Every structure is written in C-alpha cells, then in structure tokens.
Amino acid sequence: GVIINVKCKISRQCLKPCKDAGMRFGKCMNGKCHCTPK
C-alpha cells in the first residue's frame, strides 16, 4: 500500500489527503500513515 512517512499523530490527518488521492484506508501505524488505496 501507499505508506507515507508523515507522523500520524492521528489517523484522520493521514486519511484526509489519502482518500482524496485514492486511498480508501488511512491508519496510523508505528509512526507512519498506512494509506490503503481506494
């Protein structure tokens, strides 16, 4: 999946730009934003 090395203080901060790009999921994991494609 498309994992971004952005500090996920919260999953919503990752998912917002991810689902807008084409990531149906966006979960904060180990410090990275795990954005699974739409």
UniProtKB/Swiss-Prot annotation:
Disulfide bond entries: 8-28, 14-33, 18-35
Record carries keyword Nucleus: no
Superkingdom of source: Eukaryota
Signal peptide start-end: none
Protein localization: Secreted
GO cellular component: extracellular region
Tissue: Expressed by the venom gland.
Pfam families: Toxin_2 (PF00451)
MF terms (GO), sorted A to Z: ion channel inhibitor activity; potassium channel regulator activity; toxin activity
Entry keyword annotation includes Acyltransferase: no
Principal subcellular localisation of the protein: secreted
Domain notes: Has the structural arrangement of an alpha-helix connected to a beta-sheet by disulfide bonds (CSalpha/beta).
Name of the protein in question: Potassium channel toxin alpha-KTx 3.7
Organism name: Orthochirus scrobiculosus (Central Asian scorpion)
